[PDB]
Design a protein around this ligand. Structure first.
Ligand code: ADP
Ligand code: ADP
Ligand code: BEF
Ligand code: BEF
Ligand code: MG
Ligand code: MG
Lengths: 417, 495, 417, 207
RNA sequence: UUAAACCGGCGUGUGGC
């Protein structure tokens, strides 16, 4: 059956299921290797397996169906996709495909997908006759995505502050500029939880690049939705692989008129990997970055856009500063001008155990009038007018005190009265 | 192993004539030709050595065709179930993996294919060095002459060819002479000869004029069209944008100097300089000059034009091989018709009032009413099957019996046009001497008479190939039939 | 037929037209790839296609006819131009050429232009016998280009203020010095709209370099005229390509005695691209800019000039400050001395929600007496005399209040009375 | 070179024009080279001056490396060990004589060929010739002609090549040319020399 | 011009009949 159906559960149920299948000792091999052996035996029972995965296209023309729980990486259960399907339907990268698969005969490699039964949770007829992603008409954020939870938690403020600092909507391009040891982890955690709880209609796609495996395990089983990540366990090759794969999945899902939130941390390590995997042009820039090292990062960053026809792609990629060297800062610079949504976090206030320390001054949103109603916009303008003339510490303590003294944001408006 | 091949592809001098991609496709072909020697089974083997990433991995091509000889490369039109091929053509397999690696004869094949590939790259280079003038007059000496083409040299190893249709039928050639034509087609990826010059194709004259006439080239006299007959006769219709320009005496020159120079450069080719008109009727009138036509009948749908010259000038108007007409039929691209000499050669007033035998019973409830009406024409008989009542009033006395007789005669006209059509489509006529032949039914006789023979004597003098592609007979029954025909006609010795 | 004739319309009409042509599924390939396939089929019908485009000359000697709607970039419908045309007419870069084209035979690349029928909207005879651009005699702005709309909109002031701060005319060289988040976008928008509405005689050529694709879509279908842009989707190579191509098109159009307005934003990103694409001279300047990195930017900037014989080229390139680093400021410096027209915008007043915040003090025009009549010049001198001795906030609030209290500029003169 | 180049050279200049294009292999190349060099040797023996303008020396070195026996080893770039002996002989055949006659060769060196061996030739040829002249392509692509490298050009014992005060003025002129940039020096050269007609007129205009 | 097929001379010594 489905691989993810065997993947949601730990290795223990896989071991007892393999014992039901009557095979060699399963616990010895890896759990994904266990799944490979188990699907091989299930196919030996004389039935066609039903598999699913997102497509990865190599130079040869065939495809691989990378699974969600395998972090969109190379695995023994990556379904081989013959080029004939790419000739008939021309399924591009990121297309979630589900269909019938057969076992690999000897001297082969993996399972082969015979016939597609589901293309991106839709009929296969829509796959061939469809308007493409880079072919769309990009626009600004029209619909507002509220962030406050509504029951008044302590980190619920961490969402409210955004709704009070700069709104966030569909199709936006958001940056999180923060130094190390500032509070980005818990911030994106409660951001994802609030998006999932208050707006369960949109597709939450949290992303993690080069962090601690404990952080990956804390992120996967805390938030709603798919959690694909690539820690330092994988080199720049697998980093760029998972990055382009999730971005193409988001492109296809927006092509199918659906909203995709991509919370990525951090963009600077992604840029480092990109600069690592670019050919040398015989010259270096300021900080130690190749010339063409920014083209593909800029493509990946600008993939986010709001569409006239349907769907949206909103990415929130965290920028890292205070690294001591120049190149990272260079990345940050090359990224302030491309994104139309900035959000800056404070470490000088975070060291004072003052959370959340968001830079209310340099935060902002372009075309933010489309992100909030009329009189709420007037009141936010007046509130920023009040926040401006006071000091940094003044504004921040006023924020934290008077918002913890409140429960929700409109209640905050009605209390400022 | 693979690092050695990487060193070779790094050490190739002509990295620009043959970059990495052409190098590893050449090694694809080399390993294919090597596998031709490894196994006695002649199988095409792509190996996609993946130059940049890794090394070779052997495949096997199916060569989709209904045959089965050398089954390593035989697949029918739909054998694509197994392995999830699901492709009729182009589906190829990867059965044998990691065949014999590089050995000395493999290196020999690679060496010879890469040196001939460097030669092909130099051929592309000479293509580029001869190009950029496609459609211009070029000088060139010839090397060899053949019955189908001739070779030409310009210098700097510039090799080209002029085909048989590109030459004049009577232009004598000899090595060393400096012949001139125009470079018309280029094949930068061909196998044999690369560049192609011509002397008979129409547009040549254009650039001839473009190098002769100072008017053309700045487009004061726009060349409209031109038809040609190689070395024999070429007509050309031109149009001028200015009004004080006379194309009859400006393109010709001073008492036949420009057109005469062009004809002498072409090698004695008659040229007819004609003014182009925006009306096809007046255009075909002016095209057949020297000639005069007082009988014009143009039909848009049939693409035909009844352009009949006056009686007496025929031997000059049609000319040898119908050139003056044939070129005309190539100038506009239409068909013509010249048949009458004396009996009402107007072909318009004639067919307008020559119907005394057709309308013998049309308004024949009482013939003493009125003659047939030519104002509407009564000359189509099929589009006349339905005319509105807007113009059906002018005929006085159109009672209801009269229009019923009209409908009856229209049914008669449909019958007679269907009869004329079935006699016109029946240009086979399988006679009883063609049907009574054993093994030749009605349909086989239909087809056999459609082949081009309608009698029985000429049947015995065609072979198996001449009968081949027949509808309803195999080659052996074909041979038996033609043998029986030769027995009835030649071996029987009967008359 | 014409490519732009198939390009003004979306991909939907192209799809149904290809279905009329009876080809493979068109929606699968790109819409410009759709146009390529459609023109291939149209040529298969036995007719000579009529194409047009501006010329791009490579080292080999042949040319490419880049189309307007393709942002003057590489495309499958770029008409190949044989060197024989460059031998006969010697069409230089930027020459808008229209003529007969043929389909590409196999093993070829693109369509080939047989015979030119239109050279820069003129007869081909004027192409060979013509005086060149760098061969002209540069002069100052003689004719004044008024900016006010005339019906009194809120952003109509944004034009009036220019006519009140420093006039703009044909052949001028204008700079817009402004920090990020200041109001340059809407400013150049209403500037282009006012130039188009009030002065429809001149050729409006708005330019955009490295901005958001949503901004490109908002600019293309809002203003009158051709809108060629190159966002961050293209590296420095395509940036410099489109820049030199539009500048050569403007050069040719001025050679044909026509006026060309080039509104570019921003010049600093163009300078960054130029510094990225210059060979290293083994030394760096203050800020991180190569030595010869300014030569070609200076050429592109000084291409603008007013001509004695006919036509004008007026560029308004926006300069960016407050970027934190030096090199950008360096660019700004190297650009204050070459342009003869400065215009400075305020962000310290823009953060106060006070728009439009133009620096009335450091704005100015050289030889501005040729840009306005006598008594209007006297009145502008007296008005600047009045504006000078008051504070910055004073001058700016006086400006905005008393000009929104007015409708047109001469009405403003008659109200100050 | 190109045969069209040979035809343009033969019937444009004064004197004998012997050439060997790519139509001839390395054998005929070395043949014509040694033959013209021996003709020059004999003409200098007869106390006569011979100017030998050769282009290029790198293709001659390639031919020489093609026609040398293999010594079982290769150098950096792909050149045999003894492949330079005969080229060095042909290059050093030029000399000024006490008794009579002179042999002055101007052989063009080719760089920017992508590979090493040609550059190697260039190196092996900077130390043997006592007269260098360097031309610029980075300025030639700017349509700025003639683009001669004024910096790395020079002549050994150049005091015997020009009078006293003209030498002082050339020293001061190179002093002026030095501290400015490459583009600066080159545009100054081309502009102010096209603004002049002759060289002593140029000295009298710089005044 | 192109295609197909095929592609011990001499002395010496020994031994035997
Ligand atoms: N909203 C918050 N409330 C309380 N503590 C916080 C909050 N955000 C961050 N912190 C503190 O920050 C620390 C983790 O910061 P981290 O997310 O690692 O910052 P960074 O991502 O910049 O390294 C935790 O020890 C936590 O105490
Ligand atoms: N005249 C105006 N009226 C109302 N809002 C304005 C006006 N000018 C600027 N703004 C506000 O200021 C912002 C300016 O954005 P933008 O033009 O992108 O600035 P910049 O060009 O400096 O990046 C807009 O989001 C808009 O809401
Ligand atoms: F320490 Be932080 F996550 F960069
Ligand atoms: F347009 Be903003 F100043 F990035
Ligand atoms: Mg963190
Ligand atoms: Mg802006």
């Amino acid at each position: 059956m489905n691989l993810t159906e065997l993947k949601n559960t730990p290795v223990s149920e896989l071991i007892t299921l393999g014992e039901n299948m009557g095979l060699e000792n399963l616990a010895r091999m890896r759990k994904q290797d266990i799944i490979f052996a188990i699907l091989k035996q299930h196919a030996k029972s004389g039935e066609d397996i039903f598999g699913d995965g997102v497509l990865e296209i190599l130079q040869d023309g065939f495809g691989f169906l990378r699974s969600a729980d395998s972090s969109y990486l190379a695995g023994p259960d990556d379904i081989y996709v013959s080029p004939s399907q790419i000739r008939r339907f021309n399924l591009r990268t990121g297309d979630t495909i589900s269909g019938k698969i057969r076992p690999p005969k000897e001297g082969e490699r993996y399972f082969a997908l015979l016939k597609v039964n589901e293309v991106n949770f839709d009929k296969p007829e829509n796959a061939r006759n469809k308007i493409l992603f880079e072919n769309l008409t990009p626009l600004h954020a029209n619909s507002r995505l509220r962030m406050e939870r509504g029951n008044g938690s302590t980190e619920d403020l961490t969402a409210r502050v955004l709704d009070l600092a700069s709104p966030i909507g569909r199709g936006q391009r958001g940056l999180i500029v923060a130094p190390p040891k500032a509070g980005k982890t818990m911030l994106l955690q409660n951001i994802a939880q609030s998006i999932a709880y208050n707006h369960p209609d949109c597709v939450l796609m949290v992303l993690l690049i080069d962090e601690r495996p404990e952080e990956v395990t804390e992120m996967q089983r805390l938030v709603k939705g798919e959690v694909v990540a690539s820690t330092f366990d994988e080199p720049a090759s697998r980093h760029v692989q998972v990055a382009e794969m999730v971005i193409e999945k988001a492109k296809r899902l927006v092509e199918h008129k659906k909203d995709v939130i991509i919370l990525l941390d951090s963009i600077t390590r992604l840029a480092r990997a990109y600069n690592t995997v670019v050919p040398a042009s015989g010259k270096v820039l300021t900080g130690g970055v190749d010339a063409n090292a920014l083209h593909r990062p800029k493509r990946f960053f600008g993939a986010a856009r709001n569409v006239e026809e349907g769907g949206s792609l909103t990415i929130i990629a965290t920028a890292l500063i205070d690294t001591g060297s120049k190149m990272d800062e260079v990345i940050y610079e090359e990224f302030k001008g491309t994104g139309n949504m900035e959000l800056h976090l404070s470490r000088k206030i975070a060291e004072k155990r003052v959370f959340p320390a968001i830079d209310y001054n340099r935060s902002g949103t372009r075309k933010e009038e489309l992100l909030t109603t009329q009189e709420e916009l007037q009141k936010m303008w007046i509130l920023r007018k009040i926040i401006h003339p006071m000091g940094e510490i003044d504004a921040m303590e006023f924020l934290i005190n008077k918002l913890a003294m409140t429960k929700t944001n409109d209640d905050f408006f009605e209390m400022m009265k | 192993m693979n690092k050695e091949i990487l060193a070779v592809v790094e050490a190739v001098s002509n990295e620009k004539a043959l970059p990495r991609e052409k190098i590893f496709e050449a090694l694809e072909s080399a390993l294919a030709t090597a596998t031709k020697k490894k196994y006695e089974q002649e199988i095409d083997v792509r190996v996609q050595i993946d130059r940049k990433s890794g090394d070779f991995d052997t495949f096997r091509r199916w060569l989709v065709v209904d045959e089965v000889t050398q089954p390593t490369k035989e697949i029918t039109l739909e054998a694509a179930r197994y392995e999830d091929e699901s492709l009729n053509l182009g589906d190829y397999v990867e059965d044998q993996i990691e065949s014999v690696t590089f050995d000395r004869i493999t290196t020999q094949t690679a060496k010879q294919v890469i040196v001939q590939k460097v030669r092909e790259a130099e051929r592309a280079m000479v293509v580029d060095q001869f190009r950029e003038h496609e459609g211009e007059i070029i000088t060139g000496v010839v090397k060899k002459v053949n019955r189908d083409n001739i070779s030409l040299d310009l210098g700097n190893n510039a090799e080209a060819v002029i085909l048989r249709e590109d030459m004049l039928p009577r232009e004598n050639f000899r090595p060393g002479d400096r012949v001139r034509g125009v470079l018309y087609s280029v094949r930068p990826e061909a196998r044999g000869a690369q560049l192609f010059v011509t002397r008979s194709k129409p547009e040549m004259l254009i650039e001839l004029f473009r190098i002769e006439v100072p008017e053309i080239g700045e487009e004061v006299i726009e060349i409209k069209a031109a038809a040609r007959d190689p070395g024999s006769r070429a007509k050309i219709a031109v149009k001028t944008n200015d009004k004080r320009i006379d194309p009859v005496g400006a393109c010709v020159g001073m008492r036949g100097a420009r057109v005469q120079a062009v004809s002498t450069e072409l090698g004695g080719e008659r040229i007819d300089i004609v003014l182009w008109d925006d009306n096809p009727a007046q255009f075909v009138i002016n095209a057949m000059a020297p000639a005069d036509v007082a009988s014009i009948v143009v039909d848009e749908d049939k693409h035909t034009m009844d352009i009949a010259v006056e009686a007496g000038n025929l031997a000059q108007a049609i000319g040898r091989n119908g050139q003056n007409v044939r070129l005309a039929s190539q100038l506009s691209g239409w068909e013509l018709n010249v048949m009458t000499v004396d009996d009402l050669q107007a072909k318009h007033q004639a067919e307008a009032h020559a119907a005394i035998d057709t309308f013998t019973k049309y308004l024949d409830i009482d013939e003493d009413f009125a003659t047939v009406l030519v104002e509407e024409g009564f000359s189509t008989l099929e589009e006349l099957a339905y005319v509105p009542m807007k113009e059906l009033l002018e005929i006085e006395g159109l009672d209801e019996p009269t229009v019923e007789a009209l409908r009856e005669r229209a049914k008669n006209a449909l019958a007679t046009i269907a009869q004329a059509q079935e006699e016109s489509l029946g240009d086979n006529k399988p006679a009883d001497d063609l049907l009574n032949l054993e093994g030749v039914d009605r349909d086989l006789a239909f087809k056999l008479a459609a082949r081009g023979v309608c009698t029985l004597e000429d049947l015995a003098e065609q072979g198996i190939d001449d009968l081949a592609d027949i509808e309803g007979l195999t080659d052996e029954k074909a041979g038996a039939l033609i043998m029986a025909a030769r027995n009835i006609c030649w071996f029987g010795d009967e008359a």
